[PDB]
Amino acid sequence: MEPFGTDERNWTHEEKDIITRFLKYDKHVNLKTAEMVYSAEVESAYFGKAGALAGGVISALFFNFPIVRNLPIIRRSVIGVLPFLYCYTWGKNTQEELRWLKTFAAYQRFVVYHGQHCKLWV
Amino acid sequence: GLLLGLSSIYYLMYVRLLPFNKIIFAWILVAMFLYWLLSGFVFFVKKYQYSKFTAAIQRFWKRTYIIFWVIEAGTFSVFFYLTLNASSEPVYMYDQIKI
Amino acid sequence: LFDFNPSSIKFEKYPFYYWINSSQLTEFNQYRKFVIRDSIIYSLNNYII
Amino acid sequence: TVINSEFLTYLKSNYKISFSASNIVKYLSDKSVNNSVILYLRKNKIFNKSRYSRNRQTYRTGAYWCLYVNIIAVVAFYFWFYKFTMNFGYLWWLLYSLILS
Amino acid sequence: NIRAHFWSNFALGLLITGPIFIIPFGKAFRNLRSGVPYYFRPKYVFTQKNQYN
Amino acid sequence: GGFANFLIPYHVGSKDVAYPRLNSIGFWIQPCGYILLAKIGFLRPQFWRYYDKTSFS
Amino acid sequence: GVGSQDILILSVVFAGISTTISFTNLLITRRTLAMPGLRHRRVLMPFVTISIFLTLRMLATITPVLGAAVIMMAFDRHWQTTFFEYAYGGDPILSQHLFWFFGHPEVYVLIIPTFGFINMIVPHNNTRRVASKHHMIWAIYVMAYMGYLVWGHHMYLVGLDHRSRTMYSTITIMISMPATIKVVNWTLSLVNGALKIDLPFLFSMSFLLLFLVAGFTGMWLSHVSLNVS
Amino acid sequence: RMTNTTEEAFDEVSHEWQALVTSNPFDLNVFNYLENTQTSNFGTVDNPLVVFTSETPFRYVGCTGQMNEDDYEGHELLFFLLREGSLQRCMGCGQVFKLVRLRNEYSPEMDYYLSNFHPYEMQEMGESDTTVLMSPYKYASHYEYTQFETPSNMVYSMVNPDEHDRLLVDPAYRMERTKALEEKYKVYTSSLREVE
Amino acid sequence: YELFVDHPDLAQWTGTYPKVDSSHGFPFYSTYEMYRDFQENTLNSDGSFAQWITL
Amino acid sequence: MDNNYHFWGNGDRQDVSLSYEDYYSILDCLLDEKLSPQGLMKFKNLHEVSMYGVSYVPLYCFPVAYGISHMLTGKVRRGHSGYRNLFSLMSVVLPFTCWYAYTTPIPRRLYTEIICSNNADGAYVRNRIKQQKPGIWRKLSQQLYNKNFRFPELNQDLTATEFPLDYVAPHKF
Amino acid sequence: MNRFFKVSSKYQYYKYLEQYDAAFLRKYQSETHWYLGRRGAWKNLVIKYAGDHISLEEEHNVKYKTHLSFVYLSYRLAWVLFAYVLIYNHFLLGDIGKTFNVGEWDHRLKPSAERDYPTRYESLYILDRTQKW
Amino acid sequence: WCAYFVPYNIFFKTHMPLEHAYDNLFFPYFQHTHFLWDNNALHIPTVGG
Amino acid sequence: MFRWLFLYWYNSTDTPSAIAKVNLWSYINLRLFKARLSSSIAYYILGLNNLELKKLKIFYKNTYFDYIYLKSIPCLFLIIFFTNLYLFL
Ligand code: HEA
Ligand SMILES: [Cu+2]
Ligand SMILES: [Zn+2]
Ligand SMILES: [Zn+2]
């Protein structure tokens, strides 16, 4: 149903959220596709939480690293938060990536279920 | 290195609940396999350290390298050929979407 | 290099803006089963207004 | 190098040069001679009469590696496709040979 | 008919393109990039380029 | 195995072969394939006979 | 079912690996470690060595095909890849084609060295030169060539297209041309010499007599209607 | 890319380098390429075919007879064990072979057979910076290329093994002998220039 | 002749006979064994019947 | 200005320009049922010319990639010796040069007659590109309005009572 | 020509450096002779003698040989298992159930197989595991 | 972090593949489990080594 | 540096025995580089007294494109003439 091509606009955050909530709660979605979206939502949050927690744990140690512990406060804080920022970004990006990939798979399943893709037929 | 490797090995064994005797037998066999291959290669390196690496030996090992890679690419060539002209249902009624 | 080049600027902040449903501007010559797509587009626009 | 005039005259009188030098070193100038590296080649008794080096005449690691390959093939195939494992306790004295070894 | 026209034009282009393009192209081989006159850099066979040019 | 490994060094005129290690390897890996391919008439997963009361074990 | 069939498939994989090792070791020897005068003149080597090298090259060509076929069979058995299930794309005829592409060159690998054995024994006892060693070498080499275009005479009935079937039949019937050259050369090697009757010579005569029958019966098997029957 | 023979060439590498830099028949006969042996003359009584052996009492020699352009070989391949001591002839074609047992020496006799050997190719000598050419067209014609140059400023001096060991463990003696050999090389070059 | 003198290996690959004249008695510094399969596996040589069958 | 101005695969400087990629994308939003036999013939001719062209495009990019790959290696010409690095850098760069070539619009008479035709076939093609390929139609309409083409489907239509379906790029009035 | 000025070491053996042109030393202690300059190459001789004899073929790495415990374990196991394979496949195929044990382990996703028990303990334990995904 | 923590969590703590696992594979989307692969656990010695 | 093998082997004072008395083997004097023929055909006939070394050289290897262009003009004009004659007839 979506336009296809290089010039086409990539899926925005609002479009992704709308399509996710459509797949979760609509009446025209079969139980398998809705279960796919639900399982996507269930497993994804752990990745963001774990990324944030691991970044917080590492940056607590990295704040006292042999060179970092002997730097002026501003540079010490920036270098210490660099692991936290990287790990938090990794967790959030991985959570969003997993959730959106399985949601897009569910969207493809919905489209094929209702025959809304040309050049796709049984 | 030993800490990480042994912890990973024990974690995988624990999560898969493998039969210890059978897996230890299989892993001993595979360890002997790999160890003796690598030991032969180490023998070659150590003996070619001095007084053994002539032009004939060098050309022999270059030929060995090219022959091994030609052997490896031989079966891969057949698999790639099969992949190119892969079998499919007739285009008329069975599989009209493969176009 | 040295002539007119079409601009690639496009609307970037309106959801499903380029999910264009058929009308008199599109001649109604789309894929036949896209009526469900048009209905979904209508519902999404009524949601986002 | 500078050759003494008396020595050169003595050499000219005693020996008359009649044939040219086939060595290419005659063309070398002093800069090329001074820019040369001296390398050493130890000359000892020769026993290997082939362009290939001496080859070890026993492959014990190879023999045992092939024995292990045979064991792997037979045991793994029987355990996978037949699900059969050899009952080593049937020949307990062979197993005891293994233990006592 | 098209073949006859094409081969007439091909011979004519061999006549024309040479002195306009190829012969001046030879002027690019008188010397090398560094300015030293052209010499022989072999690939594998050290051919005896004994003749003049 | 036999005739090639015996005659190629003779007829071609080579000291042993190019890979004596590979020659030994081939010979000592032959027996496993022989055993696997020759005893399928004695072996099958249904190893028990028709009068073996499988209901006892 | 799971068992002997899988054993056979993986044992064929292992046999292909062993054949790879064998022909690698043997062919690198003649190309690299040959004596200075017999690097490329194959007409000077004994006919058993010429035949062995030809069969090693043939095995080098067909071992990857056989390995691919058996690997596909194993995948179909244990992964349900449906390589030979017609319902969704596969075809068993592909498996037959692969195996017989390996198949006939294997039998030609098996038979040719015995030609070397007889071509060595007969001149030795007859203390005379063989009839035509060059022509026999070229006959076995063209037989090896034709071995890669006659693999389909084992698949006459499986329903191959008539174009392919006729190609297989016409290239198979012409393999009688090289073999008769071998027979004539052996017969002419037996004549006009000082015969020294040994025990290997009688085995050579038995081999010739046996090869006369099997060859013409196999040629009869290329008759399409007879092969159908 | 050329081996520093002062520290690395001991027995086989050392003998190969000696063959390369001297063309001494014995050494050369050890490392002659198996691909080709120089086409010698037909063996007669007055001009026997010389078969070289590097201090080995015998050698397997095959004979095919009077080679022709029509067919490359004259008669069938016949092998025999050519032994040291006297002229021995293939009776199939009456070809006389002489087994010359080359000795590890620099006698003029050894220099007599200097023209019966291919010069030792140095393309494969030393380490190579290319494993093998992945070219279907150049596999049988070209050796591996090199990104580096081959120096030509090396002068080789044979040294007795024990002395060579003292070269490796006594750097002062090594420098002394190297300086003396450089002086001798200067003297030799000056003498050659004077002769010219 | 130029191919044989300058690129002997390639010359051998072509089945070319050593073209250097050695009537003076000194053998050439780089000769080779003949490789005549190309000129033997022909419709004009000993491999005539085999090449006819392949043709 | 070649002598073969009649050729359908040929084109002048100001013909309608479509980059190969776009052309292929255009093939994904059309059906042969809706097209007349003349439109089908146009599309078949375009397919023939386009398959030959896409075959030939990497070759055109070879000298540019060959030069760029050499300049990445350095200022040394190790012909037959620097082949490994040269061809690795080529396997990298030649895709980029072909990317630029394939994303570069090229004029063609088939392009200018398939899109800009008064008949129902051209109207159908324009409407399908407008609805199913919004960005492709956006840039194509920007190109067409500068070539004195006036169609109801163009976003740059000043005589239309219906609002445009897409953003209108800046242009001279 | 710049001569080595002087050597300040009390070791009188090092005084040889003062007798040569620095470039000369540069030629025979650096560049080509860098891995040999001013060093007693005893280790070269030791390694050459190590590599030219007929020593223990079992090598672990460059520095060390394979451990004797590992070598002997491998050899004993190989010989005994090869003997077992030969004897069982040539003599003891008459009654498979007497000479072979049926054993099997499968994926934890599937239910535990009937033959997934510790052999030699069928009379004491019956083994099962909870499935996983 | 990169070689142990990241692979562990995306291999054993989820069944959803990441984009780089299948973006070039023309397979339908599917999940993967650690407990239906490599019955003969040759991956354990490989990973440990 | 020799072109003719016989010359190379007539009076060779670089033979190892001589070099054995100084023990200085220059890398620049490898026999592989000592002799190389002229890549032009050289064959021996029987002269009035002894062998005569006749040289066969058929064509030069220093031809430049301009020469190639000057001799190709008649061929190109012949092609043009024949094509136009076919068109007229
Ligand atoms: C080494 C083994 C070997 C050799 C040499 C051959 C040689 C030949 N074989 Fe084959 N063949 C097999 C092994 C061999 N074969 C096997 C194992 C199978 C079955 C595989 C399977 O299905 O299980 C098979 C199957 C087989 C078939 C399939 C039969 C069928 O399944 O329908 C055919 C038919 O085309 C055939 C033909 C030939 C031909 C035409 C030759 C020719 O090469 C032979 C020609 C030789 C001669 C012609 C020389 C004889 C000389 C004469 C002068 C005879 C004249 C003399 C008198 C009449 C007295 N073979
Ligand atoms: Cu057959
Ligand atoms: Zn003779
Ligand atoms: Zn070459």
Short mmCIF file of N, CA, C and O in Angstrom, two decimals, chain G residues 116-126 199-204:
data_model
loop_
_atom_site.label_atom_id
_atom_site.label_comp_id
_atom_site.label_asym_id
_atom_site.label_seq_id
_atom_site.Cartn_x
_atom_site.Cartn_y
_atom_site.Cartn_z
N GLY G 116 45.86 -50.23 -19.67
CA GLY G 116 47.28 -50.06 -19.40
C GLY G 116 47.95 -51.36 -18.99
O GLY G 116 49.07 -51.66 -19.41
N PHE G 117 47.27 -52.15 -18.16
CA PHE G 117 47.84 -53.43 -17.72
C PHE G 117 48.11 -54.34 -18.91
O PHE G 117 49.20 -54.92 -19.03
N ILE G 118 47.13 -54.48 -19.81
CA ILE G 118 47.34 -55.37 -20.95
C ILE G 118 48.37 -54.79 -21.91
O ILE G 118 49.21 -55.52 -22.46
N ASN G 119 48.35 -53.47 -22.12
CA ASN G 119 49.31 -52.83 -23.01
C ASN G 119 50.72 -52.83 -22.45
O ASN G 119 51.67 -52.54 -23.19
N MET G 120 50.89 -53.12 -21.16
CA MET G 120 52.22 -53.35 -20.63
C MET G 120 52.62 -54.81 -20.70
O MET G 120 53.76 -55.13 -21.07
N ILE G 121 51.70 -55.72 -20.36
CA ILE G 121 52.06 -57.13 -20.27
C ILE G 121 52.30 -57.73 -21.65
O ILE G 121 53.26 -58.48 -21.85
N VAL G 122 51.44 -57.41 -22.62
CA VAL G 122 51.56 -58.04 -23.94
C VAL G 122 52.87 -57.71 -24.64
O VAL G 122 53.55 -58.64 -25.09
N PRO G 123 53.29 -56.44 -24.76
CA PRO G 123 54.61 -56.18 -25.37
C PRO G 123 55.77 -56.78 -24.60
O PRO G 123 56.78 -57.14 -25.21
N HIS G 124 55.66 -56.89 -23.27
CA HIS G 124 56.76 -57.43 -22.48
C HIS G 124 57.05 -58.88 -22.84
O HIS G 124 58.20 -59.25 -23.10
N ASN G 125 56.01 -59.72 -22.86
CA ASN G 125 56.21 -61.13 -23.19
C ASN G 125 56.50 -61.33 -24.67
O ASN G 125 57.22 -62.26 -25.04
N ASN G 126 55.95 -60.47 -25.53
CA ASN G 126 56.17 -60.58 -26.97
C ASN G 126 57.46 -59.92 -27.42
O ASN G 126 57.77 -59.98 -28.62
N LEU G 199 52.36 -66.28 -16.84
CA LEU G 199 51.05 -66.30 -16.20
C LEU G 199 50.29 -64.99 -16.41
O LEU G 199 49.08 -65.04 -16.65
N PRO G 200 50.93 -63.82 -16.32
CA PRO G 200 50.20 -62.58 -16.66
C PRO G 200 49.66 -62.56 -18.08
O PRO G 200 48.61 -61.94 -18.32
N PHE G 201 50.34 -63.21 -19.03
CA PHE G 201 49.87 -63.20 -20.41
C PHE G 201 48.51 -63.89 -20.54
O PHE G 201 47.63 -63.41 -21.27
N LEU G 202 48.34 -65.02 -19.86
CA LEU G 202 47.07 -65.74 -19.93
C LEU G 202 45.94 -64.91 -19.32
O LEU G 202 44.81 -64.91 -19.83
N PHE G 203 46.22 -64.20 -18.22
CA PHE G 203 45.24 -63.27 -17.68
C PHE G 203 44.93 -62.15 -18.66
O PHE G 203 43.78 -61.70 -18.74
N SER G 204 45.92 -61.70 -19.43
CA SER G 204 45.66 -60.70 -20.46
C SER G 204 44.73 -61.24 -21.53
O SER G 204 43.84 -60.53 -22.01
#
